[PDB]
Amino acid sequence: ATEFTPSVYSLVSKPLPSNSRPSATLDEQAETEDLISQLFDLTADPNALVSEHGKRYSGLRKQEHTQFLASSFFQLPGKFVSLDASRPWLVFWTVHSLDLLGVALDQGTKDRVVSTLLHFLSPKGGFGGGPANSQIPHLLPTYASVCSLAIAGNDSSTGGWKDLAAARQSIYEFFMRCKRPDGGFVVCEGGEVDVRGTYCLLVVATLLDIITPELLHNVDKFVSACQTYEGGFACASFPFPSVVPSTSAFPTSEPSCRVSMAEAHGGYTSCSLNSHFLLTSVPLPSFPLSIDANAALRWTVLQQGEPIEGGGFRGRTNKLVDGCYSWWVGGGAPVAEELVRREKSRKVIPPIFNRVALQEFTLVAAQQDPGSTGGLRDKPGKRPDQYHTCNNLSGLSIAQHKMSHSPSTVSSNRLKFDASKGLPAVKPVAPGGGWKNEDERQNARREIWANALGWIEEEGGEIIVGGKDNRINTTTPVFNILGLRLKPFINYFYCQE
Template sequence: MGTSATRIQYLRRNLLGRKREVVTRVISTEDEGDQNEIISIMKEVETDTSIARDEVIEKCQALYEEAQTIPELHRDAHKKFLDASFTNDLPPQMAALDASQPWLLYWTANSLRVLNEKYLTKEYQFRICEKLFAISPTGGPFGGGVGQLPHLASTYAAINALALCENGEDYWDMVDEKAIYDWLISLKQENGGFKTCLGVGEVDTRGVYCALSVASMLGIMTDELTEGVVDFLVDCQSSEGGFGGCPHEDEAHGGYTFCAVASLHILDAIDRINIPNLAKWCSQRQLDPERGLSGRSNKLVDGCYSFWVGGTAAVMELYGLDHLINKSSLRDYILYCCQNGSRPGLRDKPGTHPDLYHTNYILLGLALCENSFNLSDNGKAVQCKPLPVTAPSHLSSINPIYGLPTKNVQKFISHFV
């Protein structure tokens, strides 16, 4: 008996990650007015997640109730937070991001462009491009840092960062499209997916999106590159309606779902999936009373899903599916709960710290909340139209497929296509 109890404790703490004992509460809903009525009894299991959610709800409700004015974006404070990343060394605890240098450049540059297209100065652009071509002097593909293996995620972030910069120094002409194309082909798998890195990479929907985003922006999409990709993505849709990382295996997740849906739009194959189930899954990600979005079933809200799930909903808007999420409520969550009046930058939820990742994707989510999306008459160009909101944030219009300001996407693609 003692050995079994010890084994259960080991499994709970080391494999399941549970730090608290499960508590069962018995709730009776007996109607005192009618003793003959059947008494319904429900057992509510209390877990780490349910406890954490109660805490988040309490913090969100306090922020909503304490608000005295119409919420506004703390533009100047967030700009200072972003500028600091170009003028200060990263703290020691962020050393792990050494393999994500193109991502840091993309998150910071994109956030500045979204806040105001003029915030990304010529000096910043020069430094970004010099850094990227120090990582890959040959013009791509790109690794996470100098001397590191080329990686799909790093190449995606690098191309996005370059797209955010003007071509004043002919940096765009330094990109080696052929080398990147040949590398993408070398990553292609028989099942239609892409390995994220030669030899050691994963094969999932993130890799597919990164490959297709890069290829479509550089004008190197071919039948050879896209063969079997639609089937791979279709098989990643779970019974919930969202998408997992791999075919027939994973639970639906906000990040994987965005990657799959954006990829299917690039491939003009949205009609191949179960759209009603996807729409239902997106709507279920918005939680009440927090008003924000979660990335999976029975998980907490997180500001980054304002783009990953909100972006998925925006892509579906292009096909006439409006109102998958309540944009007004999501905007409230972002402006009330993802900002801290005494600290710049954007955070995932009350009680956490801001960072560059969340600042970027929350700003993108806010831009999506304040606009509607549709396709042009020829069905190719994404059009963005401001919605009537009180105290608009005046952010740049966004192309939800690429997570970039519309103007930058158009200029970059026009250069290569």
């Protein structure tokens, strides 16, 4: 099960060769190699039973990490004002990390989480980064708030889910005000346009049963054109209009071509693969426009670092490894792998990245040094924070548990779906903007629901480096919440049981 996932300690560590051509990139790379490899040399190999005397023990320090996150439920120092427009993310990073670590919140604390987030919800539609009397709605806080309510809420009158259900029409209307004719979305009124917005919006629309044809038009084309010559995805694509020199450069619904606007990055590659995957559930004709899945898988695996850098992932070519890309790049691997599997199936098994080395990076390099604040971090030399704690642990989960999208599970889901149950259909902004009829709408609901619940952990595919006390819970690819949160949440909004 580990034939093709060699431990970092079993491989020869050597620097990236210089070719006798120094540059600023190489100076920074070599300095980082020395930082990571020195910490590995001080740390007992997690795979050994005879832990060397005098060497640091790499076990996951779950109680230190729990106490690190505990400040979220009391108070954060003044320096966090830099995240005052992202407080739903502070909630999400905390409550999802506790789910992964296996630590339960009591009901009173969950009720405080629910109440805080509901004060961020505007009657006109969507969540902001703070109270609705202070901040306007934003697509990224809307994703973080919705996922946090999946983790901490419930179906009772104080559980927050009924407020989400009542807000479905207004949230949909917010999503349509964000929509551009070329398939992009602004993240907020007057805000930037990139695949982070598309990803956050498609997750929420999928979970709350508010997808329509008018919402999705050109969304597949925007995302597909973000793929670069390296195989990963950039932040956005530019729509050039039908007429060369134009009096306007504002996006149009029928551009002559689209061009990606920057280099492939793990964060935008994660958002693009996940968005594309969500779109493949939608039964529209010749939709979604395809991507080059093999190139995206190749890009994904090429970002895993060498043994001297501990087998962590970097975010882009010739930059540095960083624990948070365990989720952004590592968590895209099962999505890319499934899309490759479908391509091979249409034209007519070993792990795809080093699942062992990624765990060794998490345990050895990404944990705060023992006996201290706890928390996980980017790399040695960096302070831990809630964002690296969440994303280190989410990526560790994908490495520990072999995830795949199961066609037979999706078939079973279709067989059990009850199309006579559901919340009221959203009213489209344009008269012809909805599904053509009720047969079409119910078929769409069935496919989107059944595929959202199609991810499974493969029996016998578990690999827990360092022993079973390092095991954390299983996150879901695409949504990044536990399956035991996803299922009752999405079932509530589709009225399934």
